[PDB]
Write a protein that binds this ligand. Structure first.
Ligand SMILES: C=C(C)[C@@H]1CCC(C)=C[C@H]1c1c(O)cc(CCCCC)cc1O
Ligand SMILES: C=C(C)[C@@H]1CCC(C)=C[C@H]1c1c(O)cc(CCCCC)cc1O
Lengths: 143, 354, 354, 143, 354, 354, 143, 143
């Protein structure tokens, strides 16, 4: 709705320092640096082309609006997360102890800290078992 | 300042340890230097060229000992930047491992000779040449291939050895006196070996037509079985390298899967609608309109990691696709089971409604 | 007491028969002893070393005959503990088989020589060396591989033999008089064989440029076809061993399947709710709160056997996964057929309700 | 219900000689020996980890309660038994003569005696054919 | 009476043409006779054994010419029992084919020699030896394998030829005068060929250390590329024979499929409930309670042909199972499409009912 | 008129560039001419045949230089008909590429010699012989195969080199003085190389029994590892050619897919019921009852392109069928998801109706 | 029904010359010879085991009753005939000209004569196309 | 209906210059030449056998009537176009930018001109995205 558009206007002003209505790779890099993490120019280009519909080397506002507005259900992100969890579940039993998950997210890629893993497990251990099946997990993010 | 120092020390550790790019070129160039040293030593063995060969070999030995010493010192220095081993205690504890001991014995022997020595120099060159591997990958691969094909190699050896013995004995009987070559059974065994392997020196060869006939009829089969193991080992090497590639591919799948799960959890916890979950918000604030910007960054991270992982889910094999699609097919089984239950409840409601 | 005796006798039977672990090491050590005996005999054939070679070979022959005698006696003794053969009658009936006869003839010949003998000793050594197999696995494998590739091997032999004959005859014509080596066509055939096989003794080689040209143009093709069979047999050996591994895997699947079915039936009959079925209860009582404990044990057995069998259902091959998933897909066909019938009855009720 | 909990209390007291509320591998081994069969310490560890949710080298009471209480339908034991029977059915026809089954269970693994096989066949030969299809069998245990 | 005569003549045609069982043994025995003739001729070439070799070879030639004549006569006689060729005209027309002409020329040459002849006898033996094939299967297989791998063989030949030329020229330059072996570039080419092929006669070999170094560095690569084609052709032979087996399997599937369709139609038309269809009834009556017996026989035929065809639908390959199950999966697509249409009509009735 | 001229010039460009049919035969015949020139030069090197060899080689060189000159001129002329290069400027710019420079240097050297020259002639022949490739396909294939199997080849080289060094040194020690062949370690290295590669010249061979024993025990393993790379490269060549065939098949699939999409769009826009879309109608009128005829032609085009594409969708591989059927299975997933949603809405209506 | 049982009695008497209630391989062979065709003793054993439930080397009456009584639908003979026709349809188009079928049945296995093929095609060319699809065919025998 | 039959009569007269009721390969070739394109005699035979039901080397009128009358839905042309588009969609994402399509049809096979591609994209970009998914496309021709 209109308030969402206004929030998107404010956000775009925050990234779009030049105010040209396009998010340049330099603008994205500087805003990310303000956030703190240090990505690579090739990964910034990956950013763009993932979010860059018009292929202008930047981000027109409609792309940003659609990307913020899109929900995980709309993203069609079920099979991929399913396959990831299946990959991490060696036994193929459909379940995995929360301790192993805590270990993995704190050691792979964008390493996840203690509070985040506590939160995900709390939202996952609906049955209080620890051997969180990933079907309930995927339907949890989708729902 | 110290950050650059530690970064460069870790880079040196990586270069001396598992290399990826141009460190391969540095290893190849030190390999070239050692090879030049070996050929110079070989030439110094020759009498005619001993003068210039030795003249060049002295300076080449100086250069090679200097290079090996500096390499070992750099390796021990960089051993103190890895997680397991740090500082002085870590480097010294790492040196307790056997391979570093082999290298240091080689270095001290080189110093002692450089500070009947020909045999010691040859042995030291052999030791360092087997040393350049630094990981034992080739020997592990060869052992694994031999073990995998143990039955084929053993049967090939059995048949080939039996053929060698039998053909050699028959030729010996056929040429006991008519040929000076086969006076003793040991001579016959040597002949049979150098034929079946197809080396064929020509020092010994049957001259009686009975011996020639036996040699022909047995050498066909013998050379076939003696050549077997080469092809067997070639196929084994190919299969083993394919398996190693598959394992590396699966690890490269493992990592982005964790990346995607992390990013997905972060994005899910990043929704502004719900405020009970703050872990991701606190983490991003600690790393640091603003909140919508954070959500934009996190949803972008989810999208890019989804792209990366989906690309990482490439087939690479029939078995891989069968496995993934079979997971999908079990999902199909579950869904059709649910549909069966639903149609059963429909048919139950039927009479209830009717 | 007697239980330990029978257990050890059965273990001895297993060791002398199909070995699994360190019995391989005992077989390898007796193999080492026999090999040492063969090399000592070879050296005793030589004149210069005949003295010490014979001095060591006498004691080695004593040791080897003792070892073979005790091994055969232990084998015959352990033949009387297996199910087929027991006691004295079973062992004697087992000895009626041919392989035991070969072994006993070898032993008695060794005793007779040890109690022109060189040729007999050589033949006895050859016989025992072919004997160490004790199962004929290598010969079975080789025969199966040859039969499987009979067409490829036969065509390779045909082409190679034709090339040998043709090249040899052409070289003979080209060097009838200009070369002493090729006086007769038999000499030319010997040359062609020792070239095409790539043995190349060097005793015979064309010297006229016409002969050299013909030899080159024909030896390329000839050596290619003469090398063919080595690779063919290597591939055949690999494939045959893979097939044997697949069969062993399927047997290892067969056994835990029966284990699971047995445990599942026992657990199903172990429910305390129903009392009509007592077979499992009677069996467990015969082997022997208490009943719930029995049910706990049996449900645990079901769980563990389910784990074992599910692990045993590993792919090992594309064909395996395709077969299992295709059974699942036929199940899908049945389920969708049922759903079609149900929706048909729904559409039939439609007008009936409406 | 409560009576089931009381029966589980009695059973746990029967195995848990120490009375510590945990079924140690030694306690399981001795109770099994009282039963009569002779398993292996590695197979006892397999026992534990199959039933050991908390991974303490023993069995907390909730694990035992869930394991006794679980029914074959809850066990999700349909595809596995299906595959086992399919393995034993060489023809792939879906059927197998009861004589072959009697032969197999009396010869493989935990060999089954005459009374047990008579009972299973009686419960299986609902149509009185002898060529017991395994679909009716699996739905029989599940039902 | 005449039925047995025609049956035996057709059996003779089958034996002389494509054999299945012990006709292979007859072909192998005639092969043994021809091989004995070739070896006897080879020995007759030798001077020392010319006497007894010729004495045996005369009678062996008599026997072989008799056998070949009777075989050709039987072949021509049996050519007049097949469908294409019958009686005298059919046999004569069949003889117009080239292979029969080759055989008859061989026979008449044998008669003329048996009624500088050594060269003619050798050529006739070569011709008949290439003749024993009688089908050209080996040459077809070899040509197909070469054509399939034309690119690999051509690149291997190119690289090997270039390596031969280059190494030979470099060695020639390095040993122009210091070695008598390499006086001319042709000598160097001969050396390079007999090394790279690994024949290594030893008549020519570099003796200058520069020449030895060049020969080593080039012979490694040269022998590798010269050995390539053997393995390439082995793999090609294996793959081609596998493809031929697959085609034969598909034909063996084709035939029982027609059997099953025929039996199914017959059984369907054999139902006693309907009488409009009499074709099967008329056919069975022509071949000849009674009608129910006919239906029993026909339903049995349907059952047995169903068993035969279902067995004939064995995998033999991953591709086969994928194809069959994919037909099943397309059937699944059709069924789910029907279910979608049905649920659409249900949702259409919904508002209509409501 | 000019249309035929341009068509023939383009055909000439195609013939000199990538050939398909009988242009292969023209290339093979020029290859035959160059090969005849090389053999004539080789013979001219020989002294005895120098007269006639040179007499023929002069005219052969004239013919070959004429042929190469006309071929290069035709190539440069046809370079001016392709899209990239036209007329004079295009041909000259194309000549700026390196391969044309190599060819022109070869031509000018041939003219200069034809207008110590033996070495220059040999080098020019070598250069043109490497030139006949004109595309570098063989070298690309070999490099790709080596890179793919870099690990296997490197480990084989490491093991073989170590075995060579060790066996050679041990034999040298065992035959330092008792054999004149192994006076220096370089001699031993030469021997070890010519044995392990199985060349076996016979100039050097151990004569002391210790040396013979060491040579045997090491040459078994050495020849195995020295033969490895041949089989490895053969398998690599086969796999690489299979991959290239797969890529070509996928391109041949790509083209008819576009054909079908074009024809389908044209047919859809060709319906006479709707008149808003005229693009296809305008195109067909520009190319030119009448309209129905156009629709008939276009629907025929759709049908024939559908046949062509469906044929083009042949398996060629298991992976291909798995991919296509897996797309179908994902479609199945979508359809069953829709059915689940529909049955959910049915169960929602249930209570609403009831 | 009862009349069907009586017809089966008459048929069994016709084959069972010995009157022992079992159809011996010799009885089957002689009745077939009366019919006219000449099968092989191994193929006769195939006959038996296909119809021999009790495995007595003969045919007890219940087996014969079930075999006559069974209908093609009960036989579960859909996938097999489907696969056969698919095998004979090289194009995979799902259709085949009746001329090719006529050629095949008159040349393969138990060769089919003109009247039989005319009848099957008449019952198959419901649409009068000649390119008889085999789906309508299989559902025709099943129906 | 009748008017459709009359239009088919007129069309057949237009191709069937001989007026024999059969479309000979020569008649098809000359009418195509009048249209403008230049096909090959083998491709003309392909034409015939694709449309030639009676296999007479020509086209009887019923074949022409059925071929004109058949609609794309009746043609069963869904999986094939699906597979073609999937082939052209390298990413497997299910979508493709209209620019790539424009490039392909103007460069492959029967090259498509500007107006045709503009029309197809207009009828395809129902959502106005440019990344036309091919599912909406296939259901568009089918619908
Ligand atoms: C029909 C066979 C056996 C193949 C294929 C046809 C050709 C031209 C030769 C055979 C062959 C060689 O016999 C040897 C090499 C190595 C290169 C030698 C340099 C002249 C390659 C090479 O393909
Ligand atoms: C391009 C070819 C043909 C391969 C790959 C590149 C290399 C360095 C050599 C070839 C090759 C040999 O020619 C011989 C061996 C055996 C070891 C010999 C010891 C020096 C291995 C080995 O890879």
């Amino acid at each position: 709705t209109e308030e969402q558009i206004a929030e998107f206007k404010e956000a775009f002003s925050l990234f779009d320092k030049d105010g040209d209505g396009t998010i340049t790779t330099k603008e994205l890099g500087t805003v990310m640096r303000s956030l703190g993490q240090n990505p690579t120019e090739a990964e910034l280009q990956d950013m763009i082309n993932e979010v860059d519909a018009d292929g202008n080397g930047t981000i027109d506002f409609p792309e940003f609006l659609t990307m913020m507005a899109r929900k995980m259900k709309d993203t069609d992100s079920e099979e991929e997360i399913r396959e990831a969890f299946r990959v991490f579940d060696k036994d193929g039993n459909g379940y995995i102890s929360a301790a192993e998950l805590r270990h993995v997210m704190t050691n792979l890629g964008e390493k996840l800290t203690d509070e985040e893993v506590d939160e995900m497990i709390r939202e996952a251990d609906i049955d209080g078992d620890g051997q969180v099946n990933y079907e309930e997990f995927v339907q949890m993010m989708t729902a | 300042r110290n950050a650059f120092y530690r970064k460069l020390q870790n880079f040196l550790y990586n270069v001396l340890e598992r290399p990826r790019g141009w460190a391969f070129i540095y290893h190849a160039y030190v390999f070239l230097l050692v090879a030049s040293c070996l050929v110079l030593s070989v030439f110094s063995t020759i009498k005619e060229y001993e003068k210039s060969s030795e003249g060049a070999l002295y300076i080449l030995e100086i250069v090679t000992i200097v290079v090996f010493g500096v390499e070992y010192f750099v390796r021990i220095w960089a051993a103190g930047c890895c997680c397991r081993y740090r500082g002085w205690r870590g480097r010294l504890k790492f040196a307790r491992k056997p391979f570093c001991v082999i290298d240091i014995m080689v270095l001290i022997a080189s110093i002692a000779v450089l500070a009947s020595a020909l045999r010691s120099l040859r042995f030291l060159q052999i030791l360092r040449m087997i040393r350049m591997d630094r990981r034992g990958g080739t020997w592990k691969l060869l052992g694994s291939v031999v073990y995998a094909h143990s039955k084929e190699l053993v049967t090939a050896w059995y048949i080939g050895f039996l053929c060698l013995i039998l053909a050699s004995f028959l030729v010996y009987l056929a040429e006991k006196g008519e040929n000076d070559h086969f006076d003793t059974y040991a001579d016959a065994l040597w002949w049979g070996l150098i034929t079946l392997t197809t080396i064929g020196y020509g020092d010994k060869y049957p001259q009686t037509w009975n011996g020639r006939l036996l040699a022909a009829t047995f050498t066909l089969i013998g050379v076939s079985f003696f050549a077997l193991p080469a092809g067997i080992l070639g196929s084994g090497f190919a299969l083993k390298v394919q398996e190693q590639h598959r394992q590396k591919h699966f690890e490269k799948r493992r990592n982005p899967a964790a990346g995607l799960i992390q990013s997905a959890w972060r994005f899910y916890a990043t929704n502004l609608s719900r405020t009970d979950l703050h872990s991701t918000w606190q983490y991003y604030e600690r790393t640091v309109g603003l909140k919508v910007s954070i959500r934009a960054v996190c949803v972008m991270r989810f999208l890019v990691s989804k792209r990366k992982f989906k690309e990482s889910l490439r087939p690479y094999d029939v078995m891989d696709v069968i496995e993934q699609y079979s997971a999908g097919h079990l999902d199909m089984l579950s869904r059709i089971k649910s549909l069966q239950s639903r149609v059963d409840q429909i048919v139950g409601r039927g009479p209830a409604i009717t």
